[PDB]
């Protein structure tokens, strides 16, 4: 029995419970396959699920109860909402526990001096900066402007972007930031002849930004917008200043950037299957539960946990009463060594951060379509032709 502490919103009352309920089939498949093939020969993986409704109070209560009443847990697995995830991840080191998340995408968790024991199988949303760098190098865009909403996540994404570009020859002409209304800032962007704009703002502020861009005439054949792509699908007509035709005319052609759910290769993964077969069996396993985006990352996370427990038992003393510093260090050093082809690509960690594939999508007439990928392990950007298009003949130049 190798007990694992599973924290994720399973409650129906919370909106984020959809993530846990759609992820559970994937983790079930992974653990049942591990039990069948018997990777851990004498032991067996015991995943204990503790429900956290993304309330900091209830999440901390569940964590405390699992620490005291539950078995001796070796690791923590899960953490979907950012508040509870931050609370647990900062404090893990006190109990020598090691966390592996699959939904916590905030870039602040990448600080390995405040979160030394935190790991991620999902690319954080500040890992889209080298993807944007390769996209800029692909079209010879050597002068960009930025429009950043002033909260923590976007500020950190921008403070990382400015360091990614350091050494290259892409200069940030103008830098802007707003808090409540971006209209004052789009005017300053227009008044400096900024052609390529890297926006880091929220979903509710995106509608305002695009309305202010339509009013400022910051669109058409000679302007390009590159905004985040994790917005929910059909996020424009859900809003109800500018009537929808102008909003759509202002946002036609923006390139979203986001991580990719599943791989597109056919090479056999560590499970002995291909990503297409895994997706087929996942879709026929869950009957009516809503499909989540993190099911592949949960499959890979369970396989990472199994492999790291295996290679930690290889170097072995085994008891864990939350006092064993040595066992925590052994599990850390074993998790740092994870390298295998999972269902979402190759699973490699660079200081706790997963090196995955970032996909590009472009808003055509009334829907977003995929227009390329960026493989961060090989550092290669491939743009799917026949898909990406521009309103002018050539790409807009700065």
């Amino acid at each position: 029995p190798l007990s694992i502490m599973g924290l994720m919103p399973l409650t129906k009352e919370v909106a984020k419970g959809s993530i846990g309920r759609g992820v559970l089939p994937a983790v079930e498949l992974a653990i049942e396959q591990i039990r069948n093939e018997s990777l851990l020969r004498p032991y067996f993986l015991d995943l204990r699920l503790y429900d956290t409704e993304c309330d900091n109070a209830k999440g901390l209560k569940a964590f405390y109860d699992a620490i005291k009443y539950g078995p001796n847990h070796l690791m923590v697995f899960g953490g979907v909402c950012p508040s509870v995830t931050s609370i647990i991840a900062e404090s893990l080191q006190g109990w020598n526990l090691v966390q592996l998340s699959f939904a916590a995408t905030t870039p602040v968790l990448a600080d390995k001096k405040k979160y030394p024991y935190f790991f991620r199988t999902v690319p954080s949303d500040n890992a889209v900066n080298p993807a944007i760098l390769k996209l800029l190098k692909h079209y010879q865009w050597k002068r960009v402007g930025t429009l950043t909403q002033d909260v923590q996540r976007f500020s950190e994404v921008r403070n990382d972007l400015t360091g990614v570009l350091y050494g290259e020859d892409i200069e940030i002409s103008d830098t802007e930031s707003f808090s409540n209304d971006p209209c004052t800032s789009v005017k300053k962007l227009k008044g400096n002849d900024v052609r390529i704009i890297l926006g880091q703002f929220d979903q509710n502020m995106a509608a305002k930004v695009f309305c202010c861009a339509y009013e400022e005439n910051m669109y058409g054949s000679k302007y390009q917008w590159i905004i985040p792509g994790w917005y929910e699908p059909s996020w424009w007509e859900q809003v109800h200043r500018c009537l929808r035709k102008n909003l759509l005319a202002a946002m036609e052609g923006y390139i979203g950037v986001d991580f990719e759910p599943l791989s597109s290769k056919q090479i056999k993964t560590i499970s002995g299957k291909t990503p297409q077969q895994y997706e087929r069996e996942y879709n026929n396993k869950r009957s009516g539960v809503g499909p989540s985006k993190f099911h592949g990352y949960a499959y890979d996370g369970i396989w990472v946990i199994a492999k790291t427990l295996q290679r930690a038992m290889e170097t072995l003393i085994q008891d864990f009463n939350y006092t064993d510093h040595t066992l925590g260090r052994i599990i850390l050093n074993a998790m740092n060594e994870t390298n295998f082809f999972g269902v979402t690509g190759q699973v490699v960690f660079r200081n706790g951060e997963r090196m995955g594939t970032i996909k590009f999508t472009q808003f055509q007439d009334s829907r977003e379509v995929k227009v390329g990928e960026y493989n961060a392990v090989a550092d290669t950007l491939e743009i799917i032709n026949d898909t990406i298009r521009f309103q002018g003949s050539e790409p807009p130049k700065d």
């Binding site: 209560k61 900062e90 404090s91 006190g94 830098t175 930031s177 808090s179």
Partner: protein
Amino acid sequence: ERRAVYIGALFPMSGGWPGGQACQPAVEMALEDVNSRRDILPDYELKLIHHDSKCDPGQATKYLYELLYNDPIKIILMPGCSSVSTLVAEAARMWNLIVLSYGSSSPALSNRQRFPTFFRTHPSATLHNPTRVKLFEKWGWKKIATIQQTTEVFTSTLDDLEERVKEAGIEITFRQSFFSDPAVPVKNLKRQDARIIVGLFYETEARKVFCEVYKERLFGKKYVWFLIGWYADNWFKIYDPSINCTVDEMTEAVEGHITTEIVMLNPANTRSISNMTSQEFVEKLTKRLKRHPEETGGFQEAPLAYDAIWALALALNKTSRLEDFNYNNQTITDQIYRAMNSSSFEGVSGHVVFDASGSRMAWTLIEQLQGGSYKKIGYYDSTKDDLSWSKTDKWIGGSPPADQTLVIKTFRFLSQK
């Protein structure tokens, strides 16, 4: 013979704000003074169980677990800085506990629908904002910049400063934020030509901010910095291995910056409920300390801890019932909540009242660094609109600088020769 009742506490002895060093002996003094008196609790006894939270939510989480899951049942917790206070106050509704802070100034902790059982003796940090707006209006500045750290206390202070400053016709042109590294926002401030800068960050981080300011030459005759007056008096001369800028460079990197702080101590010489004036309190505290007051962190917040302990004791006396308290029922905790909500007594830091707005103090001290030392340059009372200006502030050139130097319509005249 007396049934002991226990309180939990978390004193930050290090980190962002090391207030525990001088707020823990104050709590010891207050507990001794309230246990010696037979009028307050004739049959109970207030005892303290404390831990050094170091002012970070990780060790605070560990010690909160050790507190809530150990031998003595606690009736109230007393966290320190704003981070630990927010964590405990939003986690304490599951165990039905009351949280009473003494040094927590986060404006976000005034939300009753989010921190339902939270009290504090420290004023909210929204009091610095009207003083800043008054200093902007006096000197005629209309567009300012900000460089904060993304902690909830500074975010809330900046939001309130925003809705304040927008009300008087002044705009914040540039907003920068950073989590642990200020180099990029500092160089973005330099590249954007910002003149009047409001920095909202802790001291151990102000040192890094100002190292990066020195390396960017973002100081001199054109720039004015508005910091927080709660840092140590020699915070720029303190040796710090994380920064590369030496002491002599940093001493001139920060020169002529304005700071604001609240008084926190009763200026009058009347006697409080403990039968002790502010001078005797300060003298006993100084005799109780191990180092000098100027180098002991959190000396200006010790009366707040004293008054917090006294208010807790008075509210427990008003109900006088205690050993029947467990983390499950809601009767005793909301009884104590109703008792504390209606507290009013003359403490060593003025009239102690637990209001929702968190602003029971009025006077704001305004200072300025002149030649490596702080000199007081005024006072301000936000309610009666009083500005006791002392006419002492110095400037390079006799007059305070101005941002965005204005255009001058100079005429061309026929040569007179």
